[PDB]
């Protein structure tokens, strides 16, 4: 049966390099060639290049000529991805894929693919974050519910824990999962729904923790 | 290069037939290809030249492409038919050939029912305005199925940069949840008239508006 195994993921830091390895087994490897997908997390596929195992002629994506090659080992029936100045943008899953041949005039589908192994970009090993208060719109007087929060901003790695009032308050906390932002840092929100007549009653205390980078931060969140 | 057009999402009822399009200027002259890919696996191919099913794929899968549309077909949809669909052609790009994939359409099958979103938009606050930085965080909970698009406006025109959105996710009470955030420095923030978090949803949006006042 026809498989493809990558192995090459790695972490990485801007302006570095990354080599990914695609090794085929049971069919003959120097009868199809093989192309190269990543996805970033959360959006589509990218198609990057295709390599002909045969000869090793590539067809590379032109956003990519001059930092991308992609070589061929015949002895060992593996396929190579080389990816030069990385940056933030390039954090990815990248996936190997069968394909017959592609040419000047035609180009086969992708009928087998690899698992795909990820390459993180970052930019630092170890942040801690910035927490800024997210204060309630309605105040004391206004009716109804409130919603109040704390933004946590700029941190890496995952995770950051989040409670309110020492774990004291539990009803209407909702932390957000965190965004991967372009900067390769993470940033999340968590956002308490209160009675608005507690606002100028109870204190509202969020308990950020980030044990990556060894901090906590007891945020007080005021009615503006 | 060569560009294909996907909705973001399509929602069906169990049993119902699920259409995904793709568009591209005159792709009835091209081979299409239909990709399904499942979270945190890798895509499967499941309709090949247009209209040809692989090898083990379900009768159930077929493919059609005239004029400016191709088109997979999921009848009698199953759960487990839940998935991002990818179409993709080949291009001869003008002698440096390529491939080009849509964007990928987010297929769900109801199995619960519609949740319309609750939209929360926080401004930037005073401290980080204090310290030079300015966010503005939107906020995206209860909503089901579990497909958005988020769109920011300074004023009146759209704002792409500087712009994060998550993933939707599930809540703990098996709805979906997710955030959108959209960075610029404090004057940007302070020169528009007000800044908006507009977020689609089944074909409905909800608007939130924020005001430097």
């Known amino acids: 049966e026809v498989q493809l195994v990558q192995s090459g993921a790695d972490v990485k830091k801007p302006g570095a390099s990354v080599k990914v390895s695609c090794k085929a087994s049971g069919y003959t490897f120097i009868h199809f060639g093989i192309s190269w997908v990543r996805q970033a997390p959360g959006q589509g596929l990218e198609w990057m290049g295709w390599?002909?195992?045969?000869?090793?002629?590539?067809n590379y994506a032109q956003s990519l000529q001059g930092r991308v090659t992609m070589t061929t080992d015949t002895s060992t029936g593996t396929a190579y991805m080389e990816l030069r100045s990385l940056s933030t943008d390039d954090t990815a899953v990248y996936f190997c894929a069968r394909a017959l041949e592609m040419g000047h005039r035609s180009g086969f589908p992708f009928d087998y693919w690899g698992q795909g192994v990820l390459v993180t970009v970052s930019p630092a090993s170890t942040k801690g974050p910035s927490v800024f208060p997210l204060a309630p719109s309605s105040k004391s007087t206004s009716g109804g519910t409130a919603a109040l929060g704390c933004l946590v901003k700029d941190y890496f790695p995952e995770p950051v824990t989040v409670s309110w009032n020492s774990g004291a308050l539990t009803s209407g906390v909702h932390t957000f999962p965190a965004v991967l932002q372009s900067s390769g840092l993470y940033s999340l929100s968590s956002v308490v729904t209160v009675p608005s007549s507690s606002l100028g009653t109870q204190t509202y205390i969020c308990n950020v923790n980030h044990k990556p980078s060894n901090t906590k931060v007891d945020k007080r969140v005021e009615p503006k | 290069s060569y560009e294909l057009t996907q909705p973001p999402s399509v929602s069906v009822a169990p049993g119902q037939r699920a259409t995904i399009t793709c568009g591209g200027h005159?792709?009835?002259?091209?081979?299409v290809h239909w990709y399904q890919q499942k979270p945190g696996q890798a895509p499967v191919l499941v309709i090949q030249?247009?209209?040809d099913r692989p090898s083990g794929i379900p009768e159930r899968f077929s493919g059609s492409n005239s004029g400016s549309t191709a088109t997979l077909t999921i009848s009698r949809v199953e759960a487990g038919d839940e998935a991002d669909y990818y179409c993709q052609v080949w291009d001869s790009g003008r002698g440096h050939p390529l491939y080009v994939f849509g964007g990928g359409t987010k297929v769900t099958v109801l199995t619960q029912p519609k949740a319309n979103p609750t939209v929360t938009l926080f401004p930037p606050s005073s401290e980080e305005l204090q310290a030079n930085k300015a966010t503005l965080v939107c906020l995206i909970s209860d909503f089901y199925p579990g497909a958005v698009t988020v769109a920011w406006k300074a004023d009146s025109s759209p704002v792409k940069a500087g712009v994060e959105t998550t993933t939707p996710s599930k809540q703990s009470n098996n709805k979906y949840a997710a955030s959108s955030y959209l960075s610029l420095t404090p004057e940007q923030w302070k020169s528009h008239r007000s800044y908006s978090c507009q977020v689609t949803h089944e074909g409905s949006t909800v608007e939130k508006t924020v005001a430097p006042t």
């Open positions: 005159n792709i009835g002259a091209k081979n």
């Open positions: 390599i002909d195992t045969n000869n090793g002629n590539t």
């Open positions: 030249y247009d209209s």
